[PDB]
Amino acid sequence: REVKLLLLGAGESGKSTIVKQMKIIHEAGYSEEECKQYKAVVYSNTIQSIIAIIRAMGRLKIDFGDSARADDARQLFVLAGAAEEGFMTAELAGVIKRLWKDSGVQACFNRSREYQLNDSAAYYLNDLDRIAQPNYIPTQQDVLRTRVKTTGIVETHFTFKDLHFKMFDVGGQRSERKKWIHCFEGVAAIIFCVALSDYDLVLAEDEEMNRMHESMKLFDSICNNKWFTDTSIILFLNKKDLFEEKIKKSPLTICYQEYAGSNTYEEAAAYIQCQFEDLNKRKDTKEIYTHFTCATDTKNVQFVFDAVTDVIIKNNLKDCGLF
C-alpha cells in the first residue's frame, strides 16, 4: 500500500498547494489509540499559531478588521491554558474562530512570509471546528502536523484507492534543495512540479536567472540519477491555468527565443513539455509520465491524480520494485 510520493521542483513551482489538495480530495486515519496521546500537542501548537498571527499585528502595523475582535483576543490567553492540557472548551473554540476569520488577522497571515509562522498554523485553524469536537481524536495527519520547526520536511498522509500515500513536501528554493536526500528513501514515484508561467519570471535566488531554465537543470539531475532508475519519474507542469492567460500578452520567446509557435495555450505550454522530456539520457528505457496540472483547482488535481495512481500500481510494487 505504501506509495510515498516525493514533491520535487523549482521554487514557486506550487508544490505546497498540492499538499493541501490531498486533505480535501482524500481523508484517512487509522491509529486511534496512538492519536489520543498526541491530542495535547495538537491543541498546543494551534494556540501557538494564532498567537504568532496576533503579535505580528503589532510589529507590523495591522489593526483588527472588526472592533469586536478586541476582548476575544485578550480571552485567548486565558482559555489557552486548558489547551495545554489537551482540553478545548467550546468557549476557547469560537474565540479562535472570530480571530482567524477577521479581515485584519488575514492581513497578517498573507504577510506571514516575514514573521515566523507555525509550520501547520494554516492546516489547524482551517479545520479548527473538527478539532474542537468533544473527545476529539486527532486524524493520523494531525499527528504528523505536530512539532516546532526543525525537520524542514512537511509530511502529508492520505489514503487513495485503498493504498496509503505519504507525500513529502520540500521547498523548491535552492537552499532547501540540499535537504531533499532525506526523502529519497522508499519513494514510489516522484512528482516534479514546475510552473509554466515562470517562463518570464526571474528567481529570487538570482534576478538575472530565468526561473524556467533553472527548472531544466535540477530536473536533469533527478531523472538521470541512478538512484531514481527504480523509481517512476512523473513531470507535473503546474499552473497550466494562469499560464493560458499570461501567454496571451507575453511571448514565450521570453524563455526560449528560438520559439516560433502561436500564443496559444497548446503550442506554448506544450513546447516546454518538449524541452523537458528531451533532457532524458534514457528515452529508450524511461518514461517521463508528464501531466499538466492546476494546484489551485481541486477539481483538476483530482481527476489527474486518478490517472497517475494507476501507473504507480502496474509499475511500482513490493519493496521498491524488486521482491
Short mmCIF file of C-alpha atoms in Angstrom, two decimals:
data_model
loop_
_atom_site.label_atom_id
_atom_site.label_comp_id
_atom_site.label_asym_id
_atom_site.label_seq_id
_atom_site.Cartn_x
_atom_site.Cartn_y
_atom_site.Cartn_z
CA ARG A 1 0.00 0.00 0.00
CA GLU A 2 2.84 2.41 0.81
CA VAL A 3 3.41 4.73 -2.16
CA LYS A 4 5.25 7.70 -0.57
CA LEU A 5 5.31 10.27 -3.39
CA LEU A 6 8.11 12.87 -3.27
CA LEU A 7 7.46 16.54 -4.23
CA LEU A 8 10.46 17.88 -6.19
CA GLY A 9 10.54 21.18 -8.10
CA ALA A 10 11.96 24.65 -8.71
CA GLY A 11 10.96 27.42 -6.30
CA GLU A 12 7.40 28.76 -6.60
CA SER A 13 6.53 25.56 -8.51
CA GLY A 14 3.42 25.40 -6.27
CA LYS A 15 4.35 22.11 -4.56
CA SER A 16 2.89 23.48 -1.32
CA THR A 17 -0.52 23.90 -2.93
CA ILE A 18 -0.52 20.25 -3.99
CA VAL A 19 -0.12 19.24 -0.34
CA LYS A 20 -3.30 20.91 0.87
CA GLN A 21 -5.27 19.41 -2.01
CA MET A 22 -4.83 15.91 -0.58
CA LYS A 23 -6.58 16.97 2.65
CA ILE A 24 -9.67 17.78 0.60
CA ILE A 25 -9.97 15.05 -2.01
CA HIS A 26 -8.77 12.39 0.47
CA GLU A 27 -9.46 11.74 4.15
CA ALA A 28 -7.93 8.90 6.17
CA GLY A 29 -6.61 7.93 9.60
CA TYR A 30 -6.15 4.58 11.37
CA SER A 31 -4.38 4.60 14.74
CA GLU A 32 -6.96 5.90 17.18
CA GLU A 33 -5.16 4.89 20.40
CA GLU A 34 -1.91 6.49 19.25
CA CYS A 35 -3.66 9.69 18.22
CA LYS A 36 -5.08 10.36 21.67
CA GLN A 37 -1.56 10.67 23.07
CA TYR A 38 -0.85 13.49 20.60
CA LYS A 39 -4.06 15.32 21.46
CA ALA A 40 -2.25 17.67 23.85
CA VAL A 41 0.26 18.55 21.14
CA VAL A 42 -2.42 19.45 18.59
CA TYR A 43 -4.25 21.90 20.84
CA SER A 44 -0.88 23.27 21.97
CA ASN A 45 0.63 24.21 18.62
CA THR A 46 -2.67 25.69 17.44
CA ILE A 47 -2.71 28.28 20.22
CA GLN A 48 0.96 28.95 19.44
CA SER A 49 -0.02 29.64 15.83
CA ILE A 50 -2.76 32.23 16.21
CA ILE A 51 -0.66 33.94 18.91
CA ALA A 52 2.02 34.40 16.22
CA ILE A 53 -0.50 35.86 13.78
CA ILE A 54 -1.63 38.20 16.60
CA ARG A 55 1.67 39.59 17.88
CA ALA A 56 2.70 40.18 14.24
CA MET A 57 -0.20 42.66 14.03
CA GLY A 58 1.89 44.84 16.37
CA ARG A 59 5.42 44.81 14.93
CA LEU A 60 3.83 45.26 11.53
CA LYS A 61 1.11 47.93 11.79
CA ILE A 62 -2.16 46.00 11.40
CA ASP A 63 -5.49 46.79 13.05
CA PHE A 64 -8.16 44.15 13.67
CA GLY A 65 -10.84 44.35 10.96
CA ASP A 66 -13.82 44.43 13.31
CA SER A 67 -13.75 46.38 16.57
CA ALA A 68 -15.38 43.31 18.16
CA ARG A 69 -12.15 41.31 17.79
CA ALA A 70 -10.94 43.20 20.87
CA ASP A 71 -11.60 41.24 24.10
CA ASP A 72 -11.84 37.93 22.18
CA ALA A 73 -8.09 38.22 21.70
CA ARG A 74 -7.44 39.00 25.37
CA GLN A 75 -9.57 35.97 26.29
CA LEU A 76 -7.42 33.69 24.15
CA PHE A 77 -4.55 33.93 26.64
CA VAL A 78 -6.88 32.78 29.42
CA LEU A 79 -8.69 29.80 27.90
CA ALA A 80 -5.47 28.80 26.11
CA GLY A 81 -4.12 27.35 29.37
CA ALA A 82 -6.61 24.48 29.15
CA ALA A 83 -5.43 23.78 25.61
CA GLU A 84 -2.02 22.92 27.08
CA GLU A 85 -3.88 20.14 28.96
CA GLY A 86 -5.21 18.97 25.57
CA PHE A 87 -8.73 20.11 26.52
CA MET A 88 -10.79 22.51 24.38
CA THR A 89 -13.87 24.09 25.97
CA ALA A 90 -16.17 25.43 23.24
CA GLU A 91 -15.51 28.97 24.51
CA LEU A 92 -11.85 28.52 23.53
CA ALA A 93 -13.09 27.23 20.19
CA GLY A 94 -15.27 30.08 18.92
CA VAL A 95 -12.90 32.73 20.29
CA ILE A 96 -10.20 31.47 17.92
CA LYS A 97 -12.72 31.28 15.06
CA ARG A 98 -13.52 35.01 15.30
CA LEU A 99 -9.84 35.86 15.07
CA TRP A 100 -8.79 33.80 12.05
CA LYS A 101 -11.95 34.88 10.17
CA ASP A 102 -11.09 38.52 10.82
CA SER A 103 -10.43 40.72 7.79
CA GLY A 104 -7.36 42.11 9.57
CA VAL A 105 -5.81 38.94 11.00
CA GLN A 106 -5.96 37.70 7.40
CA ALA A 107 -3.99 40.85 6.58
CA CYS A 108 -1.19 39.38 8.73
CA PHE A 109 -1.19 35.76 7.56
CA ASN A 110 -0.83 36.97 3.93
CA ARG A 111 2.20 38.85 5.28
CA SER A 112 3.31 35.68 7.07
CA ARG A 113 6.49 35.42 4.98
CA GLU A 114 8.11 37.99 7.31
CA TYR A 115 7.22 36.90 10.87
CA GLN A 116 7.81 33.24 11.73
CA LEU A 117 4.57 31.21 11.48
CA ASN A 118 3.99 27.74 12.98
CA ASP A 119 4.53 25.10 10.28
CA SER A 120 0.93 23.89 10.50
CA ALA A 121 -0.70 27.20 11.51
CA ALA A 122 -2.87 27.15 8.39
CA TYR A 123 -3.88 23.48 8.36
CA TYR A 124 -5.01 23.67 12.02
CA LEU A 125 -7.04 26.89 12.08
CA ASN A 126 -8.68 25.95 8.76
CA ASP A 127 -10.08 22.79 10.39
CA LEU A 128 -10.44 24.29 13.88
CA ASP A 129 -14.03 23.05 14.17
CA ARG A 130 -13.23 19.36 13.75
CA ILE A 131 -10.52 19.52 16.43
CA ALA A 132 -12.99 21.31 18.73
CA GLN A 133 -15.41 18.37 18.78
CA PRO A 134 -15.90 16.66 22.21
CA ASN A 135 -13.39 13.89 22.97
CA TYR A 136 -11.89 14.61 19.55
CA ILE A 137 -9.32 12.12 18.26
CA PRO A 138 -6.50 13.60 16.06
CA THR A 139 -6.51 12.37 12.46
CA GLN A 140 -3.35 10.45 11.55
CA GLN A 141 -2.44 13.60 9.59
CA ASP A 142 -2.90 15.68 12.75
CA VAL A 143 -0.11 13.77 14.49
CA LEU A 144 2.36 14.45 11.68
CA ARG A 145 1.49 18.16 11.74
CA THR A 146 2.87 18.31 15.32
CA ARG A 147 6.23 19.84 16.34
CA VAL A 148 8.31 23.01 16.23
CA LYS A 149 10.24 23.80 13.03
CA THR A 150 13.33 21.60 12.64
CA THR A 151 12.77 18.66 10.27
CA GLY A 152 12.29 21.12 7.38
CA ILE A 153 10.24 18.41 5.59
CA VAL A 154 6.43 18.67 5.74
CA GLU A 155 4.58 15.35 6.00
CA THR A 156 1.18 14.63 4.44
CA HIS A 157 -0.68 11.31 4.72
CA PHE A 158 -3.81 10.31 2.79
CA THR A 159 -5.27 7.01 1.51
CA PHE A 160 -6.27 6.99 -2.18
CA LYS A 161 -7.61 3.82 -3.92
CA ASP A 162 -7.04 1.94 -0.66
CA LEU A 163 -3.24 2.48 -0.67
CA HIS A 164 -1.52 4.68 1.95
CA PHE A 165 0.33 7.61 0.40
CA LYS A 166 2.99 9.65 2.19
CA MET A 167 3.65 12.81 0.22
CA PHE A 168 6.77 14.71 1.38
CA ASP A 169 6.85 18.44 0.55
CA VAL A 170 10.25 20.12 0.26
CA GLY A 171 10.94 23.79 -0.51
CA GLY A 172 11.79 24.47 -4.15
CA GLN A 173 14.26 27.24 -3.26
CA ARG A 174 17.88 26.21 -3.79
CA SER A 175 18.61 26.49 -0.06
CA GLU A 176 16.01 23.81 0.63
CA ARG A 177 17.16 21.56 -2.23
CA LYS A 178 20.09 20.12 -0.25
CA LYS A 179 17.55 18.70 2.23
CA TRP A 180 15.96 16.58 -0.47
CA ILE A 181 18.09 13.45 0.08
CA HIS A 182 16.26 12.74 3.35
CA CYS A 183 13.11 11.91 1.37
CA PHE A 184 14.84 9.80 -1.32
CA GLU A 185 14.38 6.57 0.68
CA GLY A 186 11.35 4.38 -0.02
CA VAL A 187 9.84 6.71 -2.66
CA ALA A 188 7.42 5.09 -5.10
CA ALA A 189 7.10 7.85 -7.67
CA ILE A 190 8.26 11.45 -7.90
CA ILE A 191 6.02 14.34 -8.86
CA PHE A 192 8.20 17.16 -10.20
CA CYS A 193 6.10 20.33 -10.10
CA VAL A 194 7.06 23.15 -12.49
CA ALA A 195 5.26 26.48 -13.03
CA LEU A 196 4.65 27.08 -16.75
CA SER A 197 4.13 30.81 -16.06
CA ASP A 198 7.73 31.05 -14.80
CA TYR A 199 8.93 31.42 -18.41
CA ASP A 200 9.40 35.19 -17.85
CA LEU A 201 9.76 35.37 -14.04
CA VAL A 202 13.27 35.54 -12.54
CA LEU A 203 14.39 33.54 -9.48
CA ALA A 204 14.60 35.26 -6.11
CA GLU A 205 17.92 33.35 -5.88
CA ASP A 206 19.20 35.47 -8.79
CA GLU A 207 17.19 38.11 -10.63
CA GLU A 208 19.39 37.59 -13.72
CA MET A 209 18.34 33.93 -13.89
CA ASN A 210 15.40 32.62 -15.87
CA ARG A 211 13.23 30.57 -13.48
CA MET A 212 12.32 28.05 -16.18
CA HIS A 213 15.90 27.40 -17.26
CA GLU A 214 16.68 26.67 -13.62
CA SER A 215 13.95 24.01 -13.61
CA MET A 216 15.52 22.32 -16.63
CA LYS A 217 18.82 21.94 -14.79
CA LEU A 218 18.00 20.31 -11.46
CA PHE A 219 15.31 18.24 -13.23
CA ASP A 220 18.08 16.61 -15.27
CA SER A 221 19.94 15.77 -12.06
CA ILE A 222 16.91 13.86 -10.74
CA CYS A 223 15.60 11.94 -13.75
CA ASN A 224 19.10 10.84 -14.80
CA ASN A 225 20.01 9.96 -11.21
CA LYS A 226 20.97 6.28 -10.90
CA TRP A 227 19.11 6.05 -7.59
CA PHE A 228 15.85 7.02 -9.32
CA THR A 229 16.07 4.45 -12.14
CA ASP A 230 13.94 2.14 -9.99
CA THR A 231 11.52 4.97 -9.18
CA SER A 232 8.94 6.30 -11.65
CA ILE A 233 9.51 9.90 -12.75
CA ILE A 234 6.34 11.99 -13.31
CA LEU A 235 6.57 15.60 -14.55
CA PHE A 236 3.83 17.93 -13.23
CA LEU A 237 3.55 21.14 -15.28
CA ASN A 238 1.86 23.13 -12.50
CA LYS A 239 -0.16 26.32 -13.04
CA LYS A 240 -1.40 25.44 -16.51
CA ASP A 241 -4.40 27.63 -15.60
CA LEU A 242 -2.79 31.07 -15.11
CA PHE A 243 -0.34 30.23 -17.94
CA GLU A 244 -3.10 30.27 -20.58
CA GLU A 245 -3.82 33.88 -19.57
CA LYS A 246 -0.33 35.35 -19.34
CA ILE A 247 0.69 33.82 -22.69
CA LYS A 248 -1.95 35.96 -24.40
CA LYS A 249 0.18 39.07 -23.73
CA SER A 250 3.75 37.97 -23.06
CA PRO A 251 5.56 35.99 -25.87
CA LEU A 252 7.02 32.59 -24.98
CA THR A 253 10.22 33.99 -26.60
CA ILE A 254 10.95 35.41 -23.11
CA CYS A 255 12.26 31.90 -22.19
CA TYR A 256 13.04 30.13 -25.45
CA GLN A 257 13.87 32.82 -28.02
CA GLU A 258 14.00 30.16 -30.76
CA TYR A 259 10.24 29.58 -30.45
CA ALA A 260 8.03 30.33 -33.46
CA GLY A 261 4.72 28.93 -32.20
CA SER A 262 1.45 30.80 -31.73
CA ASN A 263 0.50 32.45 -28.43
CA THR A 264 -1.95 29.59 -27.78
CA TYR A 265 -2.10 27.58 -24.54
CA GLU A 266 -1.47 24.45 -26.64
CA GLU A 267 1.60 25.36 -28.71
CA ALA A 268 3.02 27.36 -25.80
CA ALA A 269 2.65 25.15 -22.74
CA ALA A 270 3.28 22.06 -24.85
CA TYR A 271 6.58 23.49 -26.15
CA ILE A 272 8.06 23.26 -22.64
CA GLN A 273 6.99 19.65 -22.18
CA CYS A 274 9.11 19.11 -25.31
CA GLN A 275 12.30 20.73 -23.96
CA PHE A 276 11.91 18.94 -20.62
CA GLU A 277 11.50 15.36 -21.81
CA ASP A 278 14.46 15.96 -24.16
CA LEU A 279 16.75 16.12 -21.11
CA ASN A 280 16.31 12.37 -20.56
CA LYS A 281 19.53 10.41 -21.06
CA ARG A 282 17.40 7.26 -21.39
CA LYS A 283 14.49 7.94 -23.72
CA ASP A 284 14.90 4.30 -24.81
CA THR A 285 14.01 2.94 -21.38
CA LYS A 286 12.49 5.70 -19.21
CA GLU A 287 9.05 7.33 -19.42
CA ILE A 288 8.65 10.93 -18.25
CA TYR A 289 4.93 10.46 -17.31
CA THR A 290 4.18 14.18 -17.81
CA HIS A 291 0.87 15.65 -16.65
CA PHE A 292 -0.37 19.27 -16.86
CA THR A 293 -1.96 20.33 -13.56
CA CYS A 294 -3.51 23.21 -11.62
CA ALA A 295 -2.82 23.01 -7.88
CA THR A 296 -5.18 25.92 -7.19
CA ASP A 297 -8.04 23.93 -8.74
CA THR A 298 -9.05 20.97 -6.57
CA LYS A 299 -11.18 19.64 -9.44
CA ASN A 300 -8.10 19.35 -11.66
CA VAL A 301 -5.57 17.87 -9.25
CA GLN A 302 -8.18 15.18 -8.54
CA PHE A 303 -9.01 13.58 -11.88
CA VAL A 304 -5.33 13.83 -12.86
CA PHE A 305 -4.28 12.06 -9.66
CA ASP A 306 -6.54 9.14 -10.58
CA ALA A 307 -4.50 8.53 -13.73
CA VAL A 308 -1.07 8.87 -12.15
CA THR A 309 -2.01 6.40 -9.41
CA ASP A 310 -2.67 3.67 -11.96
CA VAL A 311 0.86 3.91 -13.32
CA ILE A 312 2.22 3.50 -9.78
CA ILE A 313 0.31 0.23 -9.46
CA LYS A 314 1.17 -1.52 -12.72
CA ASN A 315 4.79 -0.33 -12.42
CA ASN A 316 5.83 0.03 -8.77
CA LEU A 317 5.21 -2.74 -6.26
CA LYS A 318 6.85 -4.75 -3.48
CA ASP A 319 9.84 -3.33 -1.59
CA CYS A 320 10.76 -0.62 -4.10
CA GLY A 321 10.27 -2.87 -7.12
CA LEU A 322 12.42 -5.97 -6.67
CA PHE A 323 10.63 -8.51 -4.44
#
